[PDB]
Symmetry: C3
Subunit: 244 residues, 3 copies
């Protein structure tokens, strides 16, 4: 009910369909995406295009009114495992902003065609939160370490232009452009693509957090600053962080 | 008989001389290159320039009519070991297309000066084949992970312009330009260069394939798709891959 | 006596004050910097700006007339440990050339705003010397592997323009620009910044040199070529290296 799945010849297009919340993820949306990725070899299909309905690709997470919110983090991990394990190449058609969980989702695609008006961001420093190690490593591999420091330490937005500059965007273009590229990719040798995808994903970005990383991760997630950031967002005011 | 070796002052230039096949490698060409690299400290020389005769740097491999074809893969590994172990800096003068084994050879150079009309490519996805891990890691370090995904998953060509953009090309220029740069490098301190080269090559790119990588590598190399790609190439038609 | 420490609101600015030698490091300057970094949470402060007085950020090392010269290498290591362990983000305002130890210092900053006329360089190949592994890894992460090969093997200078291109410079601008950015960063959530900084610095760049690296490092540092480079510098003439 929250995604749309269509297919032209050998390209399967999966569309996030929660534009009323800029395609922000919840448990149902994540579950539905995971099922669609796993099935995509039903198939016939030899490539997937992943995209969002409307103005945004995916603006993060919105668990409001969602019953299975407690399950969401683990289901989200299962979605990433499903994409990583898929033998099919996933071309992300990043049609608009990809923020937070949306940036993670875009990075888990195998290739990216990015709309002129899209941007990417981890606003973690504004929320007081902390990321898993893969998010940090894969970002660094895609924008370069220097820009990754700015994105993570200062919530810097990455424009489509700079995304193309660094390789985060393979191309600037529309959903149609991504579907055309995917159609060409669907004519290439599947076992070659499968080997290259596995080796590339196994560059070390899939990293277990170190003990010190986990300590800092827990400290951030459990902090009062995280609560303050929430209340300040609601009350339309700047947050007053304390580092605790 | 398939290479030319000349020297001006302290720069030794090694030229691939098989332009009738765009300098595609075979066992003899590989053996001769390996011997010339090892000897290059005979020497006198303090830098090497590696280049190809005519229009291409090296367009891949052509083992047709070559007696020692079965030996070729192991001899090729020995050439890379020889370059990696050489105390001399190897400036690749990439005079034209560097494809497949030619791209590997260019990446094993220590520095690259790239002709305006050259391009680099791994057409592995078109042939149904799979690469060793170093080829993938060193490519990723030189073009960035994002562009490396496109080059490997979709056979995307890297132009000289984009090579300079990413650092795959240190400079755009001709053989003469590379020889001039090499002459300056030959005046620097050899032990400093030797230390830096060893550390740089030991960035982790020299990686043993993981068990899953080897399984996928074997599946691709042993597939019917690889045979189909061959026959389709001969019969002047698009290949019909089956993923087996 | 060799640094200046000031603070506006929650940004602490630390200024190297040895412009008579282009802020080249010695034992006292290093000791004073280390103490100032450790104290910076005295504090009040939530971000640090590191900069140099006059025309250069830091042009290397000048131990001439410095009593504790034998202590300098270990004290320098302690400064880097202090910066790496600091919970505060350090914005380097690279106001002019950053060469050698100055380039190391700039790379140990968390973010960099770089003056139009600044450049970065490791002239190690001109001096006959060898670097620690982190210097090489962190450089590679910031300029890309390809440009890092040129900087290390041929003493190539990195301009401010190319620094911005690669991500070594997060922005081109002045000390004032860096202080303004730092002021914004000081309003973000400290525990988020601390987590991201630790994970980013733990990308593997902090690497113990391999046995072969240490052998080559010692050979270079103990060579006659290093002495020759010194004498040639004094006698205003090109060095005649022997590779020993
Ligand atoms: C194998 C392919 C793969 C690549 C990357 C991931 C990332 C995905 C990311 C998120 F879910 F937010 F998107 N994310 N968020 C948190 C984590 C994570 O790994 N946390 C550590 C962890 C693992 C398991 C746990 O209990 C089962 C608890 C924590 C984690 N991993 C997952 C799979
Ligand atoms: C130490 C410097 C060095 C760097 C990179 C290599 C690459 C070179 C590359 C190729 F030969 F195609 F160019 N290539 N192609 C295949 C391989 C490879 O390593 N395959 C694994 C392997 C190793 C040994 C085997 O039997 C002796 C069999 C397979 C391998 N390695 C080699 C040496
Ligand atoms: C944990 C944060 C951290 C990151 C990077 C370093 C670098 C700093 C660099 C220099 F001091 F020149 F700037 N530099 N120069 C030499 C070294 C180094 O590590 N040498 C190996 C070493 C270590 C300890 C020794 O005796 C106590 C001797 C050699 C080393 N390390 C230091 C700390």
């Amino acid at each position: 009910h929250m995604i749309g799945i269509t297919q032209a010849e050998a390209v399967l297009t999966i569309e996030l369909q929660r534009p009323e919340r800029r395609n922000a993820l919840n448990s149902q949306l994540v579950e539905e995406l995971t099922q669609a990725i796993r099935k995509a070899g039903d198939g016939s299909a030899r490539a997937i295009v992943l995209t969002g309905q409307g103005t945004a690709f995916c603006a993060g997470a919105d668990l409001s009114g969602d019953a299975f919110a407690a399950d969401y983090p683990d289901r989200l991990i299962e979605l990433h495992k499903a994409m990583d394990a898929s033998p099919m190449p996933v071309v992300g058609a990043i049609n608009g902003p990809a923020i937070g969980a949306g940036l993670q989702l875009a990075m888990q695609c195998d290739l990216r065609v990015v709309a002129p008006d899209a941007f990417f961001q981890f606003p973690t420093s504004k929320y007081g939160l902390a990321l898993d190690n893969w998010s940090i490593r894969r970002l660094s591999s895609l924008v370069g370490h220097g820009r990754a420091r700015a994105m993570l330490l200062s919530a810097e937005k990455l424009t489509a232009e700079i995304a193309l500059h660094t390789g985060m965007a393979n191309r600037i273009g529309t959903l149609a452009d991504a579907q055309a590229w995917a159609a060409e990719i669907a004519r290439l040798a599947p076992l070659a693509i499968q080997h290259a995808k596995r080796v590339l994903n196994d560059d070390g970005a899939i990293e277990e957090a170190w003990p010190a990383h986990k300590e800092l991760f827990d400290k951030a997630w459990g902090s009062q600053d995280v609560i303050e950031a929430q209340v300040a967002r609601m009350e339309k005011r700047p947050p007053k962080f304390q580092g605790a």
